[PDB]
Short mmCIF file of C-alpha atoms and ligand atoms in Angstrom, two decimals:
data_model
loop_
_atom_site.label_atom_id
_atom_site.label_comp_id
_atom_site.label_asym_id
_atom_site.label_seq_id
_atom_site.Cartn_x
_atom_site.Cartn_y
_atom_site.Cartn_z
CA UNK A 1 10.68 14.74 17.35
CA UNK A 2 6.70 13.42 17.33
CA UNK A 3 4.79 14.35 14.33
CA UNK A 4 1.21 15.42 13.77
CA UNK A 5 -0.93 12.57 12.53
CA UNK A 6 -4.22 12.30 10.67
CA UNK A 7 -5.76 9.49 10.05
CA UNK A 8 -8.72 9.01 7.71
CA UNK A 9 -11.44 6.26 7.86
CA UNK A 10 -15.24 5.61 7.56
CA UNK A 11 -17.15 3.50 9.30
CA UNK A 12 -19.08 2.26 5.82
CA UNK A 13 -15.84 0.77 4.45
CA UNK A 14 -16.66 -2.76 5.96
CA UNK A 15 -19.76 -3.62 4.33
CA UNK A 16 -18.60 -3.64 1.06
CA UNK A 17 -18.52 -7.22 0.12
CA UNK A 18 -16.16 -9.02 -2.87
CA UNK A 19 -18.25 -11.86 -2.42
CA UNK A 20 -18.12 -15.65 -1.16
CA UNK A 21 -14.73 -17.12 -1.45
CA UNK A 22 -13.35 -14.04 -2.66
CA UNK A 23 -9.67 -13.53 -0.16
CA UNK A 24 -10.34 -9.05 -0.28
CA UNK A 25 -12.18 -8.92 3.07
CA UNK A 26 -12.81 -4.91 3.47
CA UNK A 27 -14.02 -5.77 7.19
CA UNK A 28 -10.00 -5.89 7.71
CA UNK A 29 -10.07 -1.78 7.83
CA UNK A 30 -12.61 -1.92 10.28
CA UNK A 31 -10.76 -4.63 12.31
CA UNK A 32 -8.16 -2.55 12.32
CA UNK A 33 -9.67 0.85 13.35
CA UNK A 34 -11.57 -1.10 16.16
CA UNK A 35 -8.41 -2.61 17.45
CA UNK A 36 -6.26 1.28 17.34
CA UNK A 37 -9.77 2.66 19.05
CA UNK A 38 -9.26 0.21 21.69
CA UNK A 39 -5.26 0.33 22.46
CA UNK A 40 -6.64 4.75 22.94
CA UNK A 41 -4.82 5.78 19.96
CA UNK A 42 -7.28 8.57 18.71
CA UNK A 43 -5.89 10.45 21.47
CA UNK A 44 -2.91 11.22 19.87
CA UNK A 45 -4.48 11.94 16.15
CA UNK A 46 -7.29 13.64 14.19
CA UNK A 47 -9.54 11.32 12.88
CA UNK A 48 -11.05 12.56 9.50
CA UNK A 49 -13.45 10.95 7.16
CA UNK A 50 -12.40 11.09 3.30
CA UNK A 51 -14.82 12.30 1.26
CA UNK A 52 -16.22 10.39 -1.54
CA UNK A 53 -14.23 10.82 -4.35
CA UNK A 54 -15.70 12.26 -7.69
CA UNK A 55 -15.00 11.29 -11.58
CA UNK A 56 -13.51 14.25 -12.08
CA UNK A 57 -10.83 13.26 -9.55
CA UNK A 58 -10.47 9.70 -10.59
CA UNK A 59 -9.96 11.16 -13.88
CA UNK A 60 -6.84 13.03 -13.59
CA UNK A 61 -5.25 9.61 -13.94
CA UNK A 62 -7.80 7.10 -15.24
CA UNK A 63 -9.07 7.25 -18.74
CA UNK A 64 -13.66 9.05 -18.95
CA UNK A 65 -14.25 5.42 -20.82
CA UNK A 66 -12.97 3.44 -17.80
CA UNK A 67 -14.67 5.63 -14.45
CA UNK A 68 -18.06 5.52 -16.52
CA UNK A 69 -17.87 2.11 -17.11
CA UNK A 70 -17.13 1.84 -12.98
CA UNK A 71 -20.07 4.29 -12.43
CA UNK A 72 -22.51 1.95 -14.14
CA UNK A 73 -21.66 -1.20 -13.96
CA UNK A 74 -23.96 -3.22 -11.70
CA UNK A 75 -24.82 -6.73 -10.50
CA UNK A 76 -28.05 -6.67 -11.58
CA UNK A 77 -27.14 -4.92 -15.23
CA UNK A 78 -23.95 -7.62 -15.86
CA UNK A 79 -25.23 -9.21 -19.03
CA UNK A 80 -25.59 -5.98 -20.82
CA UNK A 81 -21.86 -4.76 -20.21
CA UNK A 82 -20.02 -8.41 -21.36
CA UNK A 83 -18.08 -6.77 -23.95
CA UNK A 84 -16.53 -3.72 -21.47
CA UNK A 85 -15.83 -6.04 -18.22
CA UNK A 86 -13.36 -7.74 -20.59
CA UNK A 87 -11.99 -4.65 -21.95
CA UNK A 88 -11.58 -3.20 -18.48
CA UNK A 89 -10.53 -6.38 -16.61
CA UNK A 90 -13.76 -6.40 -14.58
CA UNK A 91 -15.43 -10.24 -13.38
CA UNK A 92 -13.16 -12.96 -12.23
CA UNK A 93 -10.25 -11.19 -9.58
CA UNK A 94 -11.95 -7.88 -9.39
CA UNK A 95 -15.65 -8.76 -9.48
CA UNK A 96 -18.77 -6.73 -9.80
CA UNK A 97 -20.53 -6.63 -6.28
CA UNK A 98 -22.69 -3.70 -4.88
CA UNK A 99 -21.48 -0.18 -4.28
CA UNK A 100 -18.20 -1.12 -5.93
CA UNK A 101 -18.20 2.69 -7.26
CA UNK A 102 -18.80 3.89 -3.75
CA UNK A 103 -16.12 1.33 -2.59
CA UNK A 104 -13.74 3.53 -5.14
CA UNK A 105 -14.17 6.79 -4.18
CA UNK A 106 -13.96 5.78 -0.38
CA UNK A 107 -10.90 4.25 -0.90
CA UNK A 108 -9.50 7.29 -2.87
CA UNK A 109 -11.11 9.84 -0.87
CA UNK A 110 -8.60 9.38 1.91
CA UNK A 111 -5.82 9.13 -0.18
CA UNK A 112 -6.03 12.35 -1.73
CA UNK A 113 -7.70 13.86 1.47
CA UNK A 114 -4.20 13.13 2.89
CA UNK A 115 -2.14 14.47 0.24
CA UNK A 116 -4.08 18.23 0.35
CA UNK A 117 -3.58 18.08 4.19
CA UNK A 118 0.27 17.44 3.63
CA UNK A 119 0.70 19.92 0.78
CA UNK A 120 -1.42 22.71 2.91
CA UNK A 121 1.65 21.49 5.72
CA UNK A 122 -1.30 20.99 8.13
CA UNK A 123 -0.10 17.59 8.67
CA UNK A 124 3.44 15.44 9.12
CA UNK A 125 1.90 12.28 8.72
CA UNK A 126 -1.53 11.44 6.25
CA UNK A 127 -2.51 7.89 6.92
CA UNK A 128 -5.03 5.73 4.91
CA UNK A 129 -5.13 2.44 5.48
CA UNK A 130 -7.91 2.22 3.24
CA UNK A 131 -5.66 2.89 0.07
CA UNK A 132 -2.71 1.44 -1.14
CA UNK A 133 -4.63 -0.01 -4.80
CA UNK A 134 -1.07 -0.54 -6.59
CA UNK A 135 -2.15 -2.99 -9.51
CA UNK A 136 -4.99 -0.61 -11.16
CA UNK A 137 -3.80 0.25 -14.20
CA UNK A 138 -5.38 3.80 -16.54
CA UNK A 139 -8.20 1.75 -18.40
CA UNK A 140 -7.92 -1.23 -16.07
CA UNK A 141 -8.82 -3.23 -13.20
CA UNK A 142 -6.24 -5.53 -12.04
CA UNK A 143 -5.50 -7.82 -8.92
CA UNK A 144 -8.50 -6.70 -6.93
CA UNK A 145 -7.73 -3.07 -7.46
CA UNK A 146 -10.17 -0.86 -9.43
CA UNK A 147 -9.23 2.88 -8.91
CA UNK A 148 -5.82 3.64 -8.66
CA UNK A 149 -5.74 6.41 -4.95
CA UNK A 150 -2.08 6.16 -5.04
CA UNK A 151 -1.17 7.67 -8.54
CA UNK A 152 -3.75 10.05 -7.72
CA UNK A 153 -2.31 10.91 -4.23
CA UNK A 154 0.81 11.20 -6.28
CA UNK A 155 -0.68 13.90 -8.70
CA UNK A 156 -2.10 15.82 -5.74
CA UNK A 157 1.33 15.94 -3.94
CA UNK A 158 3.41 16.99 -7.41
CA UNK A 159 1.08 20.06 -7.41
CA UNK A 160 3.52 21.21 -4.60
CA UNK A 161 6.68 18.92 -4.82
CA UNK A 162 9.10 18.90 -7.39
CA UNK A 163 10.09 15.54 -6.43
CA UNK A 164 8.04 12.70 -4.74
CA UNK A 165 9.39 9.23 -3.65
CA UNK A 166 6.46 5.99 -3.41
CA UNK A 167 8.14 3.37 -1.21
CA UNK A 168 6.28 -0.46 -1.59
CA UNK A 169 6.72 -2.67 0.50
CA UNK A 170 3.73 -4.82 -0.25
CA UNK A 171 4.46 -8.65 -1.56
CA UNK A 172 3.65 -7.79 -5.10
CA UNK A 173 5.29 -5.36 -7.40
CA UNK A 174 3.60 -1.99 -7.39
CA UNK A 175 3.46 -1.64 -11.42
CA UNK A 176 -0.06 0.46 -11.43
CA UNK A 177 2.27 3.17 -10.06
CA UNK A 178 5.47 2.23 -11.65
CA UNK A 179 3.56 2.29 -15.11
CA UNK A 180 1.95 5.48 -14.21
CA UNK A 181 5.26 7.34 -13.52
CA UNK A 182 7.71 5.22 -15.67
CA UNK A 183 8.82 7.96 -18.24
CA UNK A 184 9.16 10.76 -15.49
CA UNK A 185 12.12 11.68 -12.90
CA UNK A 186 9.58 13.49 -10.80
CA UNK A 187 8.35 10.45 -8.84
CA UNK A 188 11.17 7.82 -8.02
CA UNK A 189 9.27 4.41 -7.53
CA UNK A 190 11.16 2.21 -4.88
CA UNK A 191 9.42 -1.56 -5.10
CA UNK A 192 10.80 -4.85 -3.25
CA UNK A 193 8.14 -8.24 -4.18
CA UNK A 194 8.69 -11.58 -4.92
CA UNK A 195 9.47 -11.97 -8.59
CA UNK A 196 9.29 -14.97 -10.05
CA UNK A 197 5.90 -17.49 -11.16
CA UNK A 198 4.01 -14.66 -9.39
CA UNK A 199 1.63 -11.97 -9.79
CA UNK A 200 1.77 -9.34 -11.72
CA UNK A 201 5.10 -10.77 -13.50
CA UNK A 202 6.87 -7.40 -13.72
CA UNK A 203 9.47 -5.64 -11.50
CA UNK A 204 12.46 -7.52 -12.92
CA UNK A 205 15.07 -5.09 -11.19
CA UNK A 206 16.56 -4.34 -14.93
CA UNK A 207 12.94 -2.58 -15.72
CA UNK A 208 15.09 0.64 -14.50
CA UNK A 209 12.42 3.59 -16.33
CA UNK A 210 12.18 4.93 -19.56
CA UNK A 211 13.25 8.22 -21.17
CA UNK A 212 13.15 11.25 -18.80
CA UNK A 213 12.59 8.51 -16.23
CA UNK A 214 15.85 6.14 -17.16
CA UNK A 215 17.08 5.38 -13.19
CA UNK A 216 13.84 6.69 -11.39
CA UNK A 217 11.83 2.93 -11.00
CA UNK A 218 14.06 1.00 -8.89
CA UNK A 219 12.95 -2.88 -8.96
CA UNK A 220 14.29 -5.29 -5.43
CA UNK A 221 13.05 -8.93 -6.53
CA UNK A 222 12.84 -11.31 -3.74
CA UNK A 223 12.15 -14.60 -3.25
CA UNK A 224 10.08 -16.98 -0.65
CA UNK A 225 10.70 -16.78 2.83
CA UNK A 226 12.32 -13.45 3.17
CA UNK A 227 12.33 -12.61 7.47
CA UNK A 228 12.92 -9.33 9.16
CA UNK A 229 16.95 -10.20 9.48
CA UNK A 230 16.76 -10.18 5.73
CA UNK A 231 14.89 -7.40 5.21
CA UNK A 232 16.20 -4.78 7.25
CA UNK A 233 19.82 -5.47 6.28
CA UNK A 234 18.65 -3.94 2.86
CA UNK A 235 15.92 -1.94 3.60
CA UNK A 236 17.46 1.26 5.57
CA UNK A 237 20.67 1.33 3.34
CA UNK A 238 18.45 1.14 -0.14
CA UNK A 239 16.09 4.02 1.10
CA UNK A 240 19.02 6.13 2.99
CA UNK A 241 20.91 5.79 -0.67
CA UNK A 242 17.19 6.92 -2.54
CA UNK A 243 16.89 9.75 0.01
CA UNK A 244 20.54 10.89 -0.78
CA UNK A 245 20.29 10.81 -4.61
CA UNK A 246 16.91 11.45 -5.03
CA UNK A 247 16.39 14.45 -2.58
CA UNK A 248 12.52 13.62 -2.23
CA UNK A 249 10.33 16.83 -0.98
CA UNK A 250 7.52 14.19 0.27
CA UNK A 251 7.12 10.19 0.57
CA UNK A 252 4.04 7.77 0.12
CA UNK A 253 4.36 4.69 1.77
CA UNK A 254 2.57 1.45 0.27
CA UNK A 255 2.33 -0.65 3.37
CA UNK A 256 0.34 -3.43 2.15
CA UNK A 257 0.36 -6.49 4.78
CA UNK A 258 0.57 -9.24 2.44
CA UNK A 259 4.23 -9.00 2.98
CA UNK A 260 3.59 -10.87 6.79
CA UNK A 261 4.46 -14.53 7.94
CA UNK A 262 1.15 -16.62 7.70
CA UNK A 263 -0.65 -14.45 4.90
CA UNK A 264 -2.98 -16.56 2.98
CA UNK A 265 -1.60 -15.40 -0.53
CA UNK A 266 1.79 -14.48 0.58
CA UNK A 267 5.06 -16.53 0.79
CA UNK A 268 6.85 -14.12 2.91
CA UNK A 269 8.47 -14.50 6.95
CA UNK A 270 8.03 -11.01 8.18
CA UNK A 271 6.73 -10.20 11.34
CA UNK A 272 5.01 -7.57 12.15
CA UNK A 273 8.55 -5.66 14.08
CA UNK A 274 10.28 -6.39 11.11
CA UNK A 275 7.51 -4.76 8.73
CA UNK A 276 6.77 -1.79 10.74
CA UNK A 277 10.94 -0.92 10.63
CA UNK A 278 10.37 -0.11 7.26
CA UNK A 279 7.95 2.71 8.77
CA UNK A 280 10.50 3.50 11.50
CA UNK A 281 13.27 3.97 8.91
CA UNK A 282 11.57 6.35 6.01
CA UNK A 283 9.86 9.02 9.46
CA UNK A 284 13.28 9.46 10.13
CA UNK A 285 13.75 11.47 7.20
CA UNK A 286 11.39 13.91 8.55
CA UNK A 287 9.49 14.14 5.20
CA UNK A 288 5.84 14.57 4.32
CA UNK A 289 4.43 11.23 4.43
CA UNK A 290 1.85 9.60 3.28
CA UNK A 291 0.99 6.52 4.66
CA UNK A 292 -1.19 3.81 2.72
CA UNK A 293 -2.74 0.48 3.14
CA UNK A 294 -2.75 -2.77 0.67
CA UNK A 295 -2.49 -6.20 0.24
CA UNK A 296 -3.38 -8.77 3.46
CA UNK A 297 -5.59 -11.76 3.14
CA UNK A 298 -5.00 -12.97 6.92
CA UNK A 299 -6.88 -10.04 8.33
CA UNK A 300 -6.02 -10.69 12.20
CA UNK A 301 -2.46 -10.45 11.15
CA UNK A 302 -3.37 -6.95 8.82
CA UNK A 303 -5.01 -5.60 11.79
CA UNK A 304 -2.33 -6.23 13.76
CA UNK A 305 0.20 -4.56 11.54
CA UNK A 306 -1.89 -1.54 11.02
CA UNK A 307 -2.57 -0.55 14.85
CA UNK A 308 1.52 -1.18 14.84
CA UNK A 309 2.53 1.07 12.09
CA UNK A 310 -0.48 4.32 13.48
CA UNK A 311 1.24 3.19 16.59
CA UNK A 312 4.91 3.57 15.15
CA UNK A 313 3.60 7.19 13.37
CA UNK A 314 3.04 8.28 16.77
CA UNK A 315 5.87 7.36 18.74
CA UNK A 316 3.65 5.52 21.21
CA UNK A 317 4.65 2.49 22.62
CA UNK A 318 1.60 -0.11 23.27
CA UNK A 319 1.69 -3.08 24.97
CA UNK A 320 1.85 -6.63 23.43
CA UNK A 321 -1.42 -8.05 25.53
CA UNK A 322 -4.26 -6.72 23.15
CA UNK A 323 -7.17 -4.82 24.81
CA UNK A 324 -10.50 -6.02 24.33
CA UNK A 325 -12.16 -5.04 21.08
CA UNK A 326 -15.13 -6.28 18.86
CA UNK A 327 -13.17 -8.63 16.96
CA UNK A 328 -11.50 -10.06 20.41
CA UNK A 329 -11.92 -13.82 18.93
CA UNK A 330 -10.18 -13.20 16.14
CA UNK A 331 -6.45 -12.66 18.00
CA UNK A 332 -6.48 -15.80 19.19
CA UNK A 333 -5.47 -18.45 20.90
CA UNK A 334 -2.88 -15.80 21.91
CA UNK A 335 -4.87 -12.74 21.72
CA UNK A 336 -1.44 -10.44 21.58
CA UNK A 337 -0.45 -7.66 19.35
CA UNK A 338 2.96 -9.38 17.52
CA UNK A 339 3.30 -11.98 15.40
CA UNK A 340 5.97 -15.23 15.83
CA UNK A 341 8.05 -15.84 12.01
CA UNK A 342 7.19 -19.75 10.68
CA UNK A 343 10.21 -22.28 10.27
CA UNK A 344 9.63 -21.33 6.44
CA UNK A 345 13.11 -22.04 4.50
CA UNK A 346 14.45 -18.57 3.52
CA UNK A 347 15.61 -18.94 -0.27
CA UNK A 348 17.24 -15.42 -0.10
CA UNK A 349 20.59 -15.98 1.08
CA UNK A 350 22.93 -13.41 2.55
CA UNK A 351 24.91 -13.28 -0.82
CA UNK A 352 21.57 -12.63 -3.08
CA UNK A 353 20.22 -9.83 -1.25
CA UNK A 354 23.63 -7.81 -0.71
CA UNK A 355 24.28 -8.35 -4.53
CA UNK A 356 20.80 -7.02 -5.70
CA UNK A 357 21.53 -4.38 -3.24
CA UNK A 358 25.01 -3.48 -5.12
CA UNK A 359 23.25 -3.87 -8.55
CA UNK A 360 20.35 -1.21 -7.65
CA UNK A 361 23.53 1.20 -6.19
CA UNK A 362 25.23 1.03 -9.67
CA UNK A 363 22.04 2.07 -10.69
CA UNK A 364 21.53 5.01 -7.83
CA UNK A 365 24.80 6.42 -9.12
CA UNK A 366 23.58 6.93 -12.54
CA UNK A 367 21.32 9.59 -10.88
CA UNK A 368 22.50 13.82 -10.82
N1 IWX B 1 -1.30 -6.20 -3.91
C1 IWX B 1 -2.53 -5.66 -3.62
C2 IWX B 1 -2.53 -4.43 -2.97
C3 IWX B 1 -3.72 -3.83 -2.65
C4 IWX B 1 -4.94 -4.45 -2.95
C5 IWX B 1 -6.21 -3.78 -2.56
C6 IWX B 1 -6.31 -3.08 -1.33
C7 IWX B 1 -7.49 -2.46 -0.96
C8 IWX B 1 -8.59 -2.53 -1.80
F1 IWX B 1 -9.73 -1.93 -1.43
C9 IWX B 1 -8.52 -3.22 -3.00
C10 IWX B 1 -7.34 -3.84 -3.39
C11 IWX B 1 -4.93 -5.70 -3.60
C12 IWX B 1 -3.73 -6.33 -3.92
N2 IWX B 1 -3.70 -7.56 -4.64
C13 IWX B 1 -3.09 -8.73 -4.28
O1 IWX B 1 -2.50 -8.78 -3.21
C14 IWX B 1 -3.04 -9.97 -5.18
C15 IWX B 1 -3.31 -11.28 -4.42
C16 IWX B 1 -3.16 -12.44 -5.41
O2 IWX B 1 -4.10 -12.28 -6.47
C17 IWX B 1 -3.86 -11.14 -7.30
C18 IWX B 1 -3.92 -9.86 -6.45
CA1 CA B 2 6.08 -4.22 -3.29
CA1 CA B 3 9.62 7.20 -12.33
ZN1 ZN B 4 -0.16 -7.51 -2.64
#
């Protein structure tokens, strides 16, 4: 039936600032909570604010070297640390801009707020929309990402699960977390991306785990133009298969937004029906779940997706007319909650994605 839902956010998250022409708009989030305050959704859901997140947390993945060098590192102390922002992948993508270590431990904080609420069962649902930093790597910053929340989410939740599944369904390949977990069967990492002359490179769907975790990273390579048709004719029976092998005790869900139709780094034709059906499909399981932003660079459309998907955690139907809200002028000229697909030529055919789908069940069966 419905599901207790909390939701973690603060109100600083916004400010933080990549810089000028940088696509990472943090303002997004508070787009987002603004619009889900407005359609009355904090009736239905506790509203928490994470806590800041400490080194000693961020350390139970991340290497002492890498969260100092994230503690200190400043814009107005660049030119001393030239040497260690190449080492840890810090100054082009993922620049240095003011309260970026406060930007980290927000970020985490609700991540691994969430996962204590779930394994205390105080909780169905933990959402953080916040979250969702797939690319950061141990000792490493990496497509805008600087502190990995959902490896550490992970950690928190294996504390009191045998077995956790992390479900991506971001445009990119999540391969901060598939790295993180790739010699262990106690997380099962489920990615679909476009692959191909694209960002990061990895998740070719033969990069199947290693050792102990041989058959526990599963890999669903895509290319342009993939639409909810597409997507939902492999999405249910891939994670209905995963749930059936893999016997998960509790589920994080990546559900980063560059995925949509119209994203300004994304090649992708989802809407945001056809993304939130991914949502739909893994609360049927009836699993702790973890819920966790990402990727989305056309923040209307992010916003959008996000009241959606709190929306879809709920079982509360809103209506498509959007209610007013302090980013009103940004919804338009149609100022409604879903999203039309573009004329976009879909390059996965029919055949491609039901013999991926076969190739990653040969796979499955491989499991005990
Ligand atoms: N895939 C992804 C997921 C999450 C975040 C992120 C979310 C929240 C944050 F606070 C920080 C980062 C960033 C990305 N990066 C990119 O989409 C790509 C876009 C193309 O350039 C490379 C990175
Ligand atoms: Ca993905
Ligand atoms: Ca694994
Ligand atoms: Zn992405």
């Amino acid at each position: 039936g419905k599901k207790k839902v909390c939701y973690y956010y603060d109100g600083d998250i916004g400010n933080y600032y990549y810089g000028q022409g940088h696509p990472m708009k943090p303002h997004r989030i508070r787009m987002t909570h603004n619009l889900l305050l407005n359609y009355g959704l904090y009736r239905k859901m506790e509203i928490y604010r994470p806590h800041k997140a400490t080194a000693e947390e961020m350390t139970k993945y991340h290497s002492d070297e890498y969260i100092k060098f994230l503690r200190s590192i400043r814009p107005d102390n660049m030119s001393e640390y030239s040497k260690q922002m190449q080492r840890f992948n810090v100054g082009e993508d993922c620049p240095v801009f003011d309260g970026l270590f406060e930007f980290c431990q927000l970020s985490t904080g609700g991540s691994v707020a969430g996962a204590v609420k779930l394994n205390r069962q105080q909780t169905d649902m933990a959402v953080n929309w916040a979250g969702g930093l797939h690319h950061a790597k141990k000792s490493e910053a990496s497509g805008f990402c600087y502190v990995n929340d959902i490896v550490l989410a992970i950690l928190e939740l294996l504390k009191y699960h045998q077995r956790v599944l992390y479900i991506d369904i971001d445009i990119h390949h999540g391969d901060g977390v598939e790295e993180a977990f790739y010699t262990t069967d106690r997380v099962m990492t489920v990615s679909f991306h476009k692959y191909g002359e694209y960002f990061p490179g990895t998740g070719d769907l033969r990069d199947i785990g290693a050792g102990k975790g041989k058959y526990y990273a599963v890999n669903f390579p895509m290319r342009d133009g993939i639409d909810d048709e597409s997507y939902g004719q492999i999405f249910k029976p891939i994670i209905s298969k995963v749930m059936e092998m893999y016997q998960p005790s509790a589920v994080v869900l990546q559900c980063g937004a560059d995925s949509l139709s119209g994203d300004r780094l994304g090649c992708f034709n989802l809407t945001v029906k056809g993304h939130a059906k991914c949502v739909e499909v893994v609360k049927t399981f009836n699993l702790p779940l973890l819920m966790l932003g990402g990727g989305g660079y056309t923040i209307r459309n992010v916003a959008r997706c996000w009241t959606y998907e709190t929306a879809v955690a709920l079982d509360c139907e809103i209506p498509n007319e959007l209610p007013y809200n302090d980013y009103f002028e940004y919804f338009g000229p149609d100022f409604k909650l879903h999203i039309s697909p573009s004329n976009m030529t879909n390059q996965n055919t029919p055949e491609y994605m039901e013999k991926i789908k076969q190739r990653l069940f040969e796979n499955l069966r491989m499991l005990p």
